Structures are given as structure tokens and as C-alpha cells.
Amino acid sequence: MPLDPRVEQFLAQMSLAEARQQFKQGALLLDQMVPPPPVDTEDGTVVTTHGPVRIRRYIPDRLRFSHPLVFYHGGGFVFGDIDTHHGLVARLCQTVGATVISVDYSLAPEAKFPVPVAECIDVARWAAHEAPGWGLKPSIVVAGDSAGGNLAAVVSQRAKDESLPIAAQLLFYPALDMVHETPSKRDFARGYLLEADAMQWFGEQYLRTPDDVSHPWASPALSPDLTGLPPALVITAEYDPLRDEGEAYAEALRAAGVPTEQIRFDGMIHGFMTMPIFPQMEAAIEAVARFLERID
Numbered sequence: 513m514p515l516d517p518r519v520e521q522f523l524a525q526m527s528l529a530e531a532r533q534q535f536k537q538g539a540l541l542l543d544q545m546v547p548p549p550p551v552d553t554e555d556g557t558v559v560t561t562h563g564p565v566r567i568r569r570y571i572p573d574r575l576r577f578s579h580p581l582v583f584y585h586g587g588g589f590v591f592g593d594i595d596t597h598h599g600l601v602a603r604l605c606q607t608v609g610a611t612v613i614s615v616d617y618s619l620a621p622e623a624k625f626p627v628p629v630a631e632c633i634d635v636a637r638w639a640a641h642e643a644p645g646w647g648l649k650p651s652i653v654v655a656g657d658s659a660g661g662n663l664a665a666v667v668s669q670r671a672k673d674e675s676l677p678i679a680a681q682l683l684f685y686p687a688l689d690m691v692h693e694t695p696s697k698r699d700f701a702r703g704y705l706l707e708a709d710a711m712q713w714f715g716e717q718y719l720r721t722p723d724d725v726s727h728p729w730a731s732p733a734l735s736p737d738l739t740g741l742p743p744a745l746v747i748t749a750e751y752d753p754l755r756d757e758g759e760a761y762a763e764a765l766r767a768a769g770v771p772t773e774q775i776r777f778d779g780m781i782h783g784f785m786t787m788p789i790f791p792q793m794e795a796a797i798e799a800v801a802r803f804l805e806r807i808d
């Protein structure tokens with residue numbers, strides 16, 4: 513099932529602080545290539561158990577969905593911010609007609625595992641508490657892309673113990689298994705934007721020691737019991753190392769009686785939902801909207 517022609521062409525044609533700017537610079541380029549919709553935003557800070565975490569609450573023109581979204585951005589645990597993922601959250605907000613809190617969680621290696629996992633829970637728990645004050649259901653919807661998809665997944669699995677109501681989880685090409693090699697991983701290890709060397713490195717920045725790989729707050733795919741987790745939208749790209757662990761984990765949720773929609777965007781690569789030059793980005797944001805209609 514061959515590459516999308518638009519993605520094909522993108523691939524064809526190409527210090528910590530330095531690489532971060534570079535990645536910020538790459539994002540904002542795209543945001544000028546394809547302007548985001550305007551949206552009302554508030555800046556703010558949540559008092560978490562690991563310090564203050566900056567957040568941005570998005571507010572849609574029409575409010576249609578009954579629960580807040582909590583978005584954890586990607587970037588491999590080392591890159592990204594609220595501004596990097598403005599393009600996606602903006603659209604999620606307006607297309608879905610929901611309130612989104614984009615979380616500025618602490619980055620690695622200056623914060624190590626499992627600090628951001630903690631932050632993300634505290635913020636979710638904060639949003640649950642705030643939700644009635646906005647005229648919404650206390651339940652929330654966690655969402656993320658890649659590393660952020662990982663957090664979403666982990667927050668969901670801790671949700672019951674942490675007494676945090678979650679009505680759904682949205683996983684955009686997440687990382688779920690740092691222990692197992694998989695056909696897609698292996699097969700798409702170099703040349704499809706997300707590479708294996710990058711992934712080894714990210715895991716050195718993020719983890720304390722190499723044994724953290726088999727920890728379920730790092731590898732949520734390894735948790736043997738998935739019964740009664742929140743409904744899941746699991747979106748994967750075809751030519752992506754993380755594709756296979758994403759799809760297996762979705763099959764597993766489904767076998768554990770968790771309402772699951774899994775969707776592969778054929779011909780696409782990892783990161784495509786923060787890459788608005790592709791039509792498939794907004795096609796997936798449409799999938800998020802449709803899925804979330806079914807949650808009530």
C-alpha cells in the first residue's frame with residue numbers, strides 16, 4: 513500500500529537547546545505553510561506534586577462536547593511545547609467543539625522518568641475538578657501524540673487507583689512498548705522521519721536506568737489487565753516504527769472489552785497529525801470528532 517504522494521515528496525526533500533529551537537522552528541514553518549484556525553486561549557499554571565506546570569485552555573466557538581480534553585504533546589519526551597502543538601490542539605478544539613487544556617509538561621533529560629507522568633495525572637485530576645465549574649461533566653478525555661500518546665495511555669491505566677474519572681483516551685501513533693522489537697519497528701527503523709537511533713537516544717534522556725523499560729508507566733503495553741479502561745481511539749500511521757505496538761495494544765483493549773476504534777492512515781508516516789501539509793491530519797481530527805460523539 514504505497515506512500516501518500518505528498519508524504520513521499522516530504523521525505524524526498526530532506527546541543528539540546530539548539531535541537532529544540534530547530535524543532536520549534538520546524539513546527540512554526542508548517543503553521544505558516546498551513547495557518548491554524550483562530551481560537552480563544554487562556555494561559556495558566558497547575559500546582560502539581562512535581563512543581564508548577566504551564567497550561568493553555570482552548571475554548572471553541574461552539575461548545576458541543578460535554579467533557580474537557582487534556583492534551584499531552586509529543587516530541588519524544590525531550591522536545592515540544594504548547595506552541596509546537598498549537599496547530600493540532602487549535603483544530604481539535606474547533607473541529608470537535610470542546611475545551612482542550614494543552615499541558616506544558618516537564619521535559620527530559622532535565623526531568624527524568626517518571627516525573628511527567630506524575631504531572632500529567634495531577635493536571636488531569638485538576639481538570640476533572642474544574643470541569644463542573646465550566647459547565648461540563650467531571651470526566652475528562654486524555655489525548656496525545658507519540659510520547660504524548662504514551663502519557664495519555666499511562667494516565668488512563670493509573671486513572672482508577674488515582675481516583676481520576678476518564679471518559680476516553682485518544683492515542684495518536686503512541687509509544688507503548690520500549691521492551692519488545694516489532695516488525696514495523698525493525699522494518700521502518702530508518703528513513704521514515706521517526707528513526708530508531710532517535711528512539712534509543714530519547715530513552716536515554718528520559719529513563720533513569722535501562723531497567724525502566726519494563727516498567728508499566730514507561731511501557732503501558734505490558735500491563736496484563738486492561739479490563740475497564742476508558743474507551744480508546746488508537747490512530748496509527750502505516751509506515752511508522754511504532755505502528756505495530758499501537759495496533760496490538762488496540763487489539764488487546766478490544767479483547768479486554770474496552771470500546772475501541774483503531775484506524776490506520778495508509779501511506780502516512782509518524783507525526784502526521786502535527787503536519788498539516790497532509791490532508792490526512794484533518795481527516796484524523798474528523799475521526800476524533802466522530803468517535804467522541806459516540807461517547808454519549
Ligand SMILES: CCCC[C@@H](CC)COC(=O)c1ccccc1C(=O)OC[C@@H](CC)CCCC
Nearest residue numbers: 586587588658659687690710711714715718783
Ligand atoms: C511531534 C510528534 C512526533 C515526535 C517524535 C520525534 C520525531 C517522537 O515520537 C515518539 O513517539 C518517540 C520518538 C522517538 C523516541 C521516542 C518516542 C517515544 O515517545 O518513546 C519511544 C521510546 C523507545 C525506546 C523512547 C523513550 C524511552 C523512555
Ligand SMILES: CCCC[C@@H](CC)COC(=O)c1ccccc1C(=O)OC[C@@H](CC)CCCC
Nearest residue numbers: 513694695750751755756757758759760761763
Ligand atoms: C494486529 C496487531 C499488529 C501488531 C504486530 C506486533 C505484535 C503484529 O503483527 C502481526 O501479527 C503481523 C504478522 C505478519 C504479517 C502481518 C502482521 C500485521 O500486523 O499485518 C498488518 C498488515 C495489514 C493488516 C500490514 C500491511 C501494510 C504495511
